[PDB]
Structure formats: structure tokens, C-alpha cells
């Protein structure tokens, strides 16, 4: 009584509603320290004339 487990399971079934169906989520957070930026984009090159 008044002493419960803080966690509870999800009811993920194939027949469950879209709202209740599982969804995988990735959050991309970017950081800028007093350090070199080591994660850069492609910046693709062109032809030579």
C-alpha cells in the first residue's frame, strides 16, 4: 500500500491501434565545446577544368 514499482510495461501487439503501436525514435543533439568540430558533412566536390 502506497509502495509501488516505478516502472510498467508496454502493451505492444501486432493488432494494437496506431497510437498504441511501437515507434522507434532517434533524437540528434549537436554539441559545440571548446574543442575541434570532428563531425562534418560531405561538402561534395565538382569536376576540374
Amino acid at each position, epitope marked *: 500500500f502506497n509502495c*509501488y*514499482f*516505478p*516502472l*510498467q*510495461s508496454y502493451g505492444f501487439q501486432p493488432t494494437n491501434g496506431v497510437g498504441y503501436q511501437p515507434y522507434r525514435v532517434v533524437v540528434l543533439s549537436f554539441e559545440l565545446l571548446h574543442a575541434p568540430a570532428t563531425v562534418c558533412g560531405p561538402k561534395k566536390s565538382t569536376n576540374l577544368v
Partner: nanobody
Amino acid sequence: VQLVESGGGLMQAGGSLRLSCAVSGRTFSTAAMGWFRQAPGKEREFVAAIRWSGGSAYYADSVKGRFTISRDKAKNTVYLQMNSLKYEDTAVYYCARTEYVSYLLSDYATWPYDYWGQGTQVTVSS
């Protein structure tokens, strides 16, 4: 995944028996283990449950003060210490396992479990 029960058998009233139930095979997680019993011609009935995390226990009224459920995580084994045995305790005892985590321990009394052992006979004599 298999639940392998052992212990029990014949004991005179007033005595004590210990049941074991070992979980074999690859498990992702265990939420709780339980003991149930079925006496001849009667419905299968909840006895005791234990949360794998923390080891909090929940008991049927009929076994309070007499039976103790316990767990050894490292051995993936649940135990039922059956003290002060009465004729009413004669039954096939079944181990059960679930991965379902409820915030509410009492839910393990009524939750349909996913995995079941083969059952172990306990017979209490005069």
C-alpha cells in the same frame, strides 16, 4: 525457455518442504516468478509471487505465515519454502514466469503468466 521444478513429494502434516524452479534457455528479462497449485478436481489457484527486481513478495491468504517465496537471480531459480504443511496443501504445484512489469505487486496474483513448469506433486499425510 523452460521452467524445471524439483523438490516436494510426500511429507507428514506439520513438516516443511522446499520447491525449486530453475529457468533455463535465453531470457531477455524476468519481471516476476510465481507459484500456483491445483488440487484434484479443483481450479488452479495462486500461491505466491516475487518480483525479480527487489524481491518483494505477494501471498495468497491461505499460505500467509506458513510459506515463503524467495529468489536467487544468479541461479535464475525461484523457491517455495512450505512450512507447517496441512492436508489442504496437497496439490500439483506449478512454477510460472512473466516478463510483464506491473507497478502494482498484487497484479501478480491475477496476471496470466507466459511460461509454466510441468508441475510437482506435494502430498501431505497424517
